Design a protein around this ligand. Structure first.
Ligand SMILES: [Ca+2]
Ligand SMILES: [Ca+2]
Ligand SMILES: [Ca+2]
Ligand SMILES: [Ca+2]
Length: 406
């Protein structure tokens, strides 16, 4: 009847007290994450030296490539030189361009919250691809991109299979050039990373085009937080050239890369019932003294500075006290340390004064009195008798859970 209203008012007040106790740590965690996802981009404000190492095996042709150069994310510019250290490449240099550093993309200011790549640094990320050459074979690559000292290093393994002996790749029919492409990026929340896809068009000497379908996943190497982007794309342009002083099989690569492409009315009255237990003098604001009274009435004993720390997190407008909108906000906040259960379990422990697993009538009477929820002895007995299913005259946790989620 009127009895779950009395349980609910007490439960919300206790929950609000538990949220006051927890709010400073929640806010620290949130600010710490924002600070941590923002540090990686600071590593890219100037020119960054780059090393690249690849070991490859295409149709049983094994080879290795070494690259060096530098990247400048302020301009979205990469300049690299690659040398085949095992002789001549068994595949055309242009088929390896995508495999040979997306942390150097220029992200415009209003998009900087969508730059996964830099946010993963310096610990770095793994980049995995399958590249399907239409009517031909496929590459599978795995790359670790990370800082080693002040140098950004890209270490790559590549495996190619099913290529045709006389196709465009093993027959070396690709022109030594490159076209512009858009690289489409979306968040992969399950893996704390991104999923990427694009199609490369390689010019063939006879005027046709060889398509190369790219599928890509990037996952952070470290355990820290990363930026998970909204859907967007990177605009890529690439130019291939040769070093006229260079005898070994090699490629000079220039890339330019820029990102683009981006309650209940009764609940309010319930909350107001809980708010009045804090606002002892009914003036509509909770002071540190009132909050301290509530905390002590619930078995805590915070210092004046702890109380101030608590009010400071919730005092959104800064007048030094807490009003109902500010109280409302705190209760609407979704916490990163709760399921449905944990709020209920924390509240049950306040009611169960001695922590023996059962709320007795004497305990309920005592906490109600301490909170100032004005109830007679008979009304407390009614609340117990209503929640009590097994008839022991006390409320265990399971009985409490049933009542609160009813
Ligand atoms: Ca007050
Ligand atoms: Ca205020
Ligand atoms: Ca007890
Ligand atoms: Ca019982």
């Amino acid at each position: 009847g009127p009895h779950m209203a009395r349980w609910k008012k007490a439960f919300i007040a206790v929950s609000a007290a538990n949220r006051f106790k927890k709010i400073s740590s929640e806010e620290e965690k949130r600010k710490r994450e924002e600070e941590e996802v923002s540090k990686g981009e600071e590593l890219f404000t100037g020119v960054v030296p780059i090393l690249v190492e690849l070991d490859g095996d295409v149709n049983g042709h094994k080879f290795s490539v070494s690259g060096e150069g530098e990247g400048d994310a302020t301009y979205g510019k990469l300049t690299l030189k690659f040398i085949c250290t095992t002789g001549k490449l068994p595949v055309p240099w242009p088929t390896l361009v995508t495999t040979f550093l997306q942390c150097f993309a220029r992200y415009p200011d209003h998009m900087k919250q969508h730059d996964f790549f830099k946010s993963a640094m310096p610990e770095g990320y793994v980049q995995e691809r399958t590249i399907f050459f239409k009517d031909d074979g496929n590459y599978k690559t795995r790359a670790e991109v990370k800082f080693e000292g002040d140098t950004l290093v890209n270490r790559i393994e590549l495996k190619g299979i099913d290529f045709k002996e006389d196709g465009n790749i093993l027959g070396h029919k690709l022109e030594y050039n490159y076209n512009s492409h858009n690289v489409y990026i979306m968040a992969d929340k399950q893996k704390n990373g991104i999923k990427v896809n694009f199609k490369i068009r390689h010019n063939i000497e006879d005027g046709s085009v060889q398509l190369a379908d790219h599928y890509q996943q990037n996952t952070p190497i470290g355990d820290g937080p990363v930026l998970l982007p909204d859907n967007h794309y990177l605009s890529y342009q690439s130019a291939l050239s040769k070093d006229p002083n260079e005898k070994r099989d090699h490629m000079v690569l220039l890339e330019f890369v820029t990102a683009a492409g981006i309650l209940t009315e009764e609940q309010i009255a319930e909350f107001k019932e809980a708010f009045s237990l804090f606002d002892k003098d009914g003036d509509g604001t909770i002071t540190t003294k009132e909050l301290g009274t509530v905390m002590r009435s619930l078995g805590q004993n915070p210092t004046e500075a702890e109380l101030q720390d608590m009010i400071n997190e919730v005092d959104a407008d800064g007048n030094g006290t807490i009003d109902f909108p500010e109280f409302l906000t705190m209760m609407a906040r979704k916490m990163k340390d709760t399921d449905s259960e944990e709020e209920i379990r924390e509240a049950f422990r306040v009611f169960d004064k001695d922590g023996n697993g059962y709320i007795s009538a004497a305990e309920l009477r005592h906490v109600m009195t301490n909170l100032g929820e004005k109830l007679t002895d008979e009304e407390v007995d009614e609340m117990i008798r209503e929640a009590d299913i097994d008839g022991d005259g006390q409320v265990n946790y399971e009985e409490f859970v049933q009542m609160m989620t009813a």
